Structure 1
Amino acid sequence: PSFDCGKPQVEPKKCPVVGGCVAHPHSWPWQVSLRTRFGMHFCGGTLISPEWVLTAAHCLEKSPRPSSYKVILGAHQEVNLEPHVQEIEVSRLFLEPTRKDIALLKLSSPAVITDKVIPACLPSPNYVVADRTECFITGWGETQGTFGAGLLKEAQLPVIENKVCNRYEFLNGRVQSTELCAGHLAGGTDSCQGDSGGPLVCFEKDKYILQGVTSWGLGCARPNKPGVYVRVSRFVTWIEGVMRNN
């Protein structure tokens, strides 16, 4: 039973995390929860192959010990995990070598790929997501009064091209070429604390492609303050190299 990357078996709501909506369970089957050995959620991540999870380097910077971490796959509820959820210990950590905010976790065992646990697709190397492309972020981060705490949420965010995002009114030059921006400039919808390390995916014809890793922002969901994501396409060669070498 082979499953194509980026093709959920439960079609997502795509409601047009603060704002957005609670996802249909298992409609974002690459979303993982990165947890302490005691089962405390602290970051998201994205399954990109049965043995590999992509996350933000800042999620791992406190401990270089793989035993500090475990990965929860197939979940919908944060607290009361579903019976099919897989909990897999991390074997090795690989931080991006130029110190950008992206990292790989090699799992101690491959995840079992099912209709609820499926990898996201990687983008082509150096792909640029065009201004205004509609994408989605997912996670179990905080909700700032918008409902759904404790459940996996999604939010539709359009990409804001870097040259726009860097304007004074927005992020005032801070965004690097190895980052991208996404958000609604009227505010109200955004990734927030506890979402970092998770995916920003953009639908292309018949599948979702992982274009961003939730990284940072100036608060959550503020008007004129879109979130910043690591631009995954600038790291595909590095990611593929790590997977090939390990």
Structure 2
Amino acid sequence: IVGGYTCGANTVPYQVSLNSGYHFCGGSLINSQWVVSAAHCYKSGIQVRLGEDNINVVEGNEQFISASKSIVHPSYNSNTLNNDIMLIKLKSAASLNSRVASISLPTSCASAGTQCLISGWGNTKSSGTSYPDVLKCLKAPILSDSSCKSAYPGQITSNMFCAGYLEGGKDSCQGDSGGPVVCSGKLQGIVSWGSGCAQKNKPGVYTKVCNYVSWIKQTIASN
């Protein structure tokens, strides 16, 4: 997260870290044993880390659970990152408490101008390389589709939305992928991609979760 702030320990209880010897992607806990993340973060043998704040120091509050199965969306396209979403079933159900809790799926899509909270352990520099120990947060609005389409000509699908600042300065970045974009208490997006980080007229692009609620529920009810 570039231009964000320290969230505060366990203030974003649904945020999870996807670890494979190191943090590589984020994710969101939507059920005691299901987390949603980006399809492009797919890896075999993923250990999900819940109740995490400082990813580099064991603070005793966290839970480490291996992924039982990863289900990538049937129409995921690596060439365009369209349908960049995947469900991960946990090997064991998480102990939901105050420091660990699931986030609700949306009932309708969020409009442009809606303020959301984006979080993750990704790079904090536009140019440099600096990964934070503690979780970073950022408040950013959902941008209009026209603005999104003009920033990324011919690259935006109906399953993506832009969020952030058109003048740059604040944005998600490498390492935030798969992470949550929560608006008014509902998970509306998943960190997907962008051209650089925090660049003028190059806002972050996120998977539009509201288009996959039926798929998510059905997948959970049959797996």
The interval holding the TM-score normalised by the smaller chain is over 0.9
Is the aligned partner of 1:111 residue 2:113? no
DSSP 3-state at the match of 2:221: helix
The equivalent residue for 1:11 is: none
- Amino acid aligned to 1:179: M
Match of 1:223 among 200, 205, 214: 200
- Amino acid aligned to 1:196: S
The equivalent residue for 2:2 is: 18
Q: Distance in 1 between matches of 2:205 and 2:135?
A: 20
Is the aligned partner of 1:164 residue 2:158? no
How does 1:68-79 map onto structure 2 within 5 Å? 68-79=45-56
The equivalent residue for 2:29 is: 47
Deviation for aligned residue 1:148: 7.7
TM-score (norm 2): 0.93
**Given that residues 36 and 88 in structure 2 are in contact (C-alpha distance below 8 angstroms), is that contact kept between their aligned partners in structure 1?**
yes
Identity rate, percent: 42
Deviation for aligned residue 1:31: 0.2
* Structure 1: gaps (5+ residues): 1-16
Q: Distance in 2 between matches of 1:141 and 1:103?
A: 19
DSSP 3-state at the match of 2:212: helix
Q: Distance in 2 between matches of 1:179 and 1:148?
A: 26
DSSP 3-state at the match of 1:71: strand
Q: Distance in 2 between matches of 1:96 and 1:153?
A: 28
Deviates more, 1:135-144 or 1:147-156: 147-156
How does 1:59-208 map onto structure 2 within 5 Å? 59-60=41-42, 63=43, 65=44, 68-99=45-76, 100-124=83-107, 127-144=108-125, 149-167=132-150, 170-203=151-184, 208=185
**Given that residues 31 and 102 in structure 2 are in contact (C-alpha distance below 8 angstroms), is that contact kept between their aligned partners in structure 1?**
yes
- Amino acid aligned to 1:165: C
Q: Distance in 1 between matches of 2:94 and 2:59?
A: 16
Deviation for aligned residue 1:174: 1.4
Q: Say if 1:161 and 1:128 are closer, same or farther in 2 by CA, change over 3 A.
A: farther
**Given that residues 21 and 148 in structure 1 are in contact (C-alpha distance below 8 angstroms), is that contact kept between their aligned partners in structure 2?**
no
- Amino acid aligned to 2:181: L
**Given that residues 148 and 162 in structure 2 are in contact (C-alpha distance below 8 angstroms), is that contact kept between their aligned partners in structure 1?**
yes
**Given that residues 162 and 177 in structure 1 are in contact (C-alpha distance below 8 angstroms), is that contact kept between their aligned partners in structure 2?**
no
**Given that residues 71 and 90 in structure 1 are in contact (C-alpha distance below 8 angstroms), is that contact kept between their aligned partners in structure 2?**
yes
The equivalent residue for 2:79 is: none
Deviation for aligned residue 1:173: 3.1
- Amino acid aligned to 1:89: S
Q: Where do 4+ consecutive residues of structure 1 move more than 4 Å? A: 145-148
Deviation for aligned residue 1:231: 0.3
Deviations 1:164-194 (A, max 9, x none): 2101xx1123111111110111111111000
**Given that residues 122 and 131 in structure 2 are in contact (C-alpha distance below 8 angstroms), is that contact kept between their aligned partners in structure 1?**
no
Q: Distance in 1 between matches of 2:131 and 2:175?
A: 14
* Structure 2: gaps (5+ residues): 77-82
**Given that residues 22 and 148 in structure 1 are in contact (C-alpha distance below 8 angstroms), is that contact kept between their aligned partners in structure 2?**
no
DSSP 3-state at the match of 1:101: coil
- Amino acid aligned to 2:33: E
Deviations 1:47-98 (A, max 9, x none): 00000000000000xx4x3xx2100000100100220200000001101011
The equivalent residue for 1:34 is: 18
Q: Distance in 1 between matches of 2:221 and 2:23?
A: 29
Is the aligned partner of 1:209 residue 2:186? yes
The equivalent residue for 1:56 is: 38
TM-score (norm 1): 0.84
- Amino acid aligned to 1:117: V
